[PDB]
Design a protein around this ligand. Structure first.
Ligand SMILES: COc1ccc(C)cc1NC(=O)N1CCN(C(=O)c2ccco2)CC1
Length: 121
C-alpha cells in the first residue's frame, strides 16, 4: 500500500470525524482571549482544529508527522492551561486525544512504509 500522497485525504477524513465529535467543540476555533485574558501568559503557541484543517488545505504540511505535531499541541495546550486535571474542557481533550491517536497510528505507519518503499533501491 505504497501511495506516498494517501495521508492527505486520510487526515481530511479524520478531521471530519473530529468535527462531528461533541468533544471537539472547545478546540475548533482559536481560544477567546476576552473570556481567558491570562491564556497567552501560559500558552506560547495557540493551536486549534480549524487552523490544522486550513494548513492542510493550503498545502502547508509536508507529512502527516507535521499535522500530528500541531494536533498534539492542541492537547498539550489544554493540559498546560487547565486549572484542574478534573476540569470539563481538559476531560474532553483527553477523550478526543485517545480517539485521534487510535486513528492516526495507521496513517503514520502507511506513510513511513511508502517512503521506505520509494527509497528501497
Ligand atoms: C468552548 O470553547 C470555545 C468556544 C469558542 C471559541 C472561539 C473558543 C473556545 N475555546 C475555549 O474557550 N477554550 C478554553 C481554554 N482551553 C482549554 O483547553 C482549557 C482547559 C481548561 C480550561 O480551558 C481551550 C478551549
Amino acid at each position: 500500500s505504497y501511495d506516498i500522497q494517501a495521508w492527505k485525504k486520510q487526515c481530511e477524513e479524520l478531521l471530519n470525524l473530529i468535527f462531528q465529535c461533541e468533544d471537539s467543540e472547545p478546540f475548533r476555533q482559536p481560544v477567546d482571549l476576552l473570556e481567558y485574558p491570562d491564556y497567552r501568559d501560559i500558552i506560547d503557541t495557540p493551536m486549534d482544529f480549524a487552523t490544522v484543517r486550513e494548513t492542510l488545505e493550503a498545502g502547508n504540511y509536508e507529512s502527516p508527522m507535521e499535522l500530528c505535531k500541531d494536533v498534539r499541541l492542541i492537547f498539550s495546550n489544554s493540559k498546560a492551561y487547565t486549572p484542574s486535571k478534573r476540569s470539563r474542557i481538559y476531560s474532553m481533550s483527553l477523550r478526543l486525544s485517545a480517539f485521534f491517536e487510535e486513528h492516526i497510528s495507521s496513517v503514520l505507519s502507511d506513510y513511513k512504509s511508502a517512503l521506505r518503499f520509494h527509497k528501497r533501491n
